[PDB]
From Swiss-Prot:
Residues 1-77 form the PNT domain. Coiled coil: none annotated. Transcriptional repressor; binds to the DNA sequence 5'-CCGGAAGT-3'. Plays a role in hematopoiesis and malignant transformation. This is Transcription factor ETV6. It is linked to A chromosomal aberration involving ETV6 is found in a form of chronic myelomonocytic leukemia (CMML). Translocation t(5;12)(q33;p13) with PDGFRB. It is characterized by abnormal clonal myeloid proliferation and by progression to acute myelogenous leukemia (AML). Belongs to the ETS family. The record marks L7, R8 as: Breakpoint for translocation to form ETV6-MDS2 in MDS. The chain holds residues 48 to 124 of 452 of the full protein. It is found in: Nucleus. Ubiquitous. Can form homodimers or heterodimers with TEL2 or FLI1. Interacts with L3MBTL1 and HDAC9. It comes from the Eukaryota. It comes from Homo sapiens (Human). The record marks R8, L9 as: Breakpoint for translocation to form PAX5-ETV6.
Length: 79
């Protein structure tokens, strides 16, 4: 479980393309239910404004995990 290099930047500087790459990494690394990138068409600054409920409406089957993954990155936790 190692973050892609470009995603090692603080998330507030993440592009919308970075967000898409994060979704792909997460899906593969944690074997999540498939996520459509069109459901998170936003940059990192916007992504950080989302609540857990917001993630779940965009990805009913993977939203919760995605939110908790982002929380772990923000907390600089390990993994
Ligand atoms: Cl902006
Ligand atoms: Mg930017
Ligand atoms: Mg972009």
């Amino acid at each position: 479980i190692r973050l892609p290099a470009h995603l090692r930047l603080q998330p507030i500087y993440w592009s919308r393309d970075d967000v898409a790459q994060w979704l792909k990494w997460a899906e593969n690394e944690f074997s999540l239910s498939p996520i459509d990138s069109n459901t998170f068409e936003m940059n990192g600054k916007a992504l950080l404004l989302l609540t857990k409920e917001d993630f779940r409406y965009r990805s009913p089957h993977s939203g919760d995990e995605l939110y908790e993954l982002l929380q772990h990155i923000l907390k600089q936790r390990d993994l």
